[PDB]
Design a protein around this ligand. Structure first.
Ligand code: ZN
Lengths: 83, 131
């Protein structure tokens, strides 16, 4: 459930992104590891910038980020979420 | 086992910073501790440098003049006392958040809790400074 984005349903991935955006962890270490995992899952060039340093006009709410990931992967030949 | 785990009170004045404060952390000697932040931490006792570090970011979260340059997600991070994430190009692997640096090394007798001896750095710049 940890190896690639096709292991996540969209809802499960949204949970991960929401956790990150809320810093909803009991330690900084945990949060950083979640962010590293995010970057590795999406394979997006922006990495964690999707979350912390949005392009102009990009939505940096949890759902906005999930949508940006979903659309990028769809547009660039990558597999999508489970289900 | 480390000198940074001995208790001390925060001292020093810091320096005026602007909106490019954290951008500056990726350059030169790193960015200063904001004078505003130093005002609020001076004379508080911390049990370790890591506790001082938590306090720095909590104060950032509470100062609108500084927190306005963090997006929603990084605001969440500092509200917990966590260091904010730097831009991807300033990260080095698993080091993704801003790091506090001592300008005069603690090894050479540099002060642990004097904020005039502390700088904010990105991981990339921190590694480069120490060479
Ligand atoms: Zn250092």
């Amino acid at each position: 459930l940890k190896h690639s984005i096709s292991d996540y349903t969209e809802a499960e991935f949204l949970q991960l992104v929401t956790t990150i955006c809320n810093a909803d962890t009991s330690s900084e270490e945990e949060l950083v590891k979640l962010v590293t995992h995010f970057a590795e899952m999406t394979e997006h060039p922006s990495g964690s910038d999707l979350i912390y340093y949005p392009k102009e006009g990009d939505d940096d709410s949890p759902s906005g980020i999930v949508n940006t990931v979903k659309q990028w992967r769809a547009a660039n030949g990558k597999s999508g979420f489970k289900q | 086992e480390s000198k940074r785990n001995k208790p001390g009170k925060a001292t020093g004045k810091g320096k005026p910073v602007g909106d490019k404060w954290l951008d500056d952390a990726g350059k030169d000697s790193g960015a200063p501790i904001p004078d505003r932040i130093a005002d609020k931490l001076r004379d508080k006792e911390f049990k370790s440098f890591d506790d001082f570090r938590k306090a720095v970011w909590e104060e950032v979260s509470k100062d609108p003049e500084l927190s306005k340059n963090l997006n929603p997600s990084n605001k969440s991070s500092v509200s917990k006392g966590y260091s904010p994430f730097t831009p991807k190009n300033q990260q080095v692997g698993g080091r993704k958040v801003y790091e506090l640096h001592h300008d005069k090394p603690i090894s050479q007798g540099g002060e642990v809790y004097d904020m005039d001896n502390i700088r904010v750095t990105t991981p990339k710049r921190h590694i480069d400074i120490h060479r």
